[PDB]
């Protein structure tokens, strides 16, 4: 029971599964699409100090990954290189075949130390961390991601109508992922 949204010509309706409207025509698997949309488009604060408050560490919950085929250009990506004060890794290494988000103008690369009191870093609002055509619930080490969400669509019968430089900004952080976190931007 996941909302499948059907796009009629010049309209979008959330397909009601109990009712059956056959007037929509789905003649091939080419018409089924998944799309990733960035939270930026809803007006959420993108500043690094504000953004970092939405993530938090948690143990006991296994990570999960789901693929998506098409995405949106991001203005802001993030890249974490975090270590514990003794010197250890609190973010897991990227599994095979997880590359960074393809297109983002600014990459906020944050390095520093924190308590990292948990096995994995999750999103407190239930959104996903979007990578290159894979959305995962957790943050991986050294791999640029965007915050986003996934939707599923039935495209219209007509194919045709529907479906570069980057900069890096470096930050130092102490007490990362805490109530009060201290940043110095270079």
């Amino acid at each position, epitope marked *: 029971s996941i909302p499948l949204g059907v796009i009629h010509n010049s309209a979008l309706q959330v397909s009601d599964v109990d009712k059956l409207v056959c007037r929509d025509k789905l003649s091939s698997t080419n018409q089924l699409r998944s799309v990733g949309l960035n939270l930026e488009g809803n007006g959420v604060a993108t500043d690094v100090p504000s953004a970092t408050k939405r993530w938090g560490f948690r143990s006991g919950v296994p990570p999960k990954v789901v693929n998506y085929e098409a995405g949106e250009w991001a203005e802001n990506c993030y890249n974490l290189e975090i*270590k514990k*004060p*003794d*010197g*250890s890794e609190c973010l897991p290494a990227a599994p095979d075949g997880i590359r960074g988000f393809p297109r983002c103008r600014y990459v906020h690369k944050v*390095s520093g*130390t*924190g*308590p990292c*009191a948990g096995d994995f870093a999750f999103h407190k609002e239930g959104a996903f961390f979007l990578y290159d055509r894979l959305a995962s619930t957790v943050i991986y080490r050294g791999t640029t991601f965007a915050e986003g969400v996934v939707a599923f669509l039935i495209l219209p019968q007509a194919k045709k109508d529907f479906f570069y430089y980057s900069t890096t900004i470096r930050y*130092q952080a*102490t*007490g990362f992922g*805490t*109530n*009060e976190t*201290e940043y110095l931007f270079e």
Partner: antibody
Amino acid sequence: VQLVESGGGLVKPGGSLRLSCAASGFTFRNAWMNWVRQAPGKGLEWVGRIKSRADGGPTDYAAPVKGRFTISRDDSKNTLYLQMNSLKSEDTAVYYCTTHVPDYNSAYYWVYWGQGTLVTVS
Amino acid sequence: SVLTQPPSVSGAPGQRVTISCTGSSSNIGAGYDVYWYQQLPGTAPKLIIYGNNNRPSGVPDRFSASKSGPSASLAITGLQAEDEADYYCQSYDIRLSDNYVFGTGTKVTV
């Protein structure tokens, strides 16, 4: 894992000195280190921290001792050098170099202190 | 800017005693591990307790520990004569850019 510190001698206040911590038993390239000193009749105390060279983070110093002391390392010799300049009053204590190194299982990082040296001013 | 601890504790042989280390929001409150070291007079401190009751090597199961809120405790059951030592609690402060803070010191007596 073993550490040995040397350089312990009496110095007239106002001079300079070099304390050397030489270790063996672990990959010395990728470990953080801290210099900690213990005064007689008092609890332990912290003086400085040096980060790994690969990370490149700036070394940090305590609040009273920031400035005069200078920490560094040398990988080709596997050593950690602490240089103290213009020694004043009450800088009199044992010095230990502490590192955190895993056990090849990486599940945790034990602490491995050193024997330390004596440094007195007069 | 130092961790607190009781001046000294006492107890009969074979019973249990607990040593308290009370921190602040920046250290233990934030979520950092607590390290316990035992210094016998004349030598250097070694590690006794790390994190959640983890023993490095050759440590009697008599030593345990807990953490709650901004405080922590070390529990030792079955005090013997050789337990005379100074115990120090350590953590990482934040207002110090994530760096050592040490406890005062406790005289455990048997």
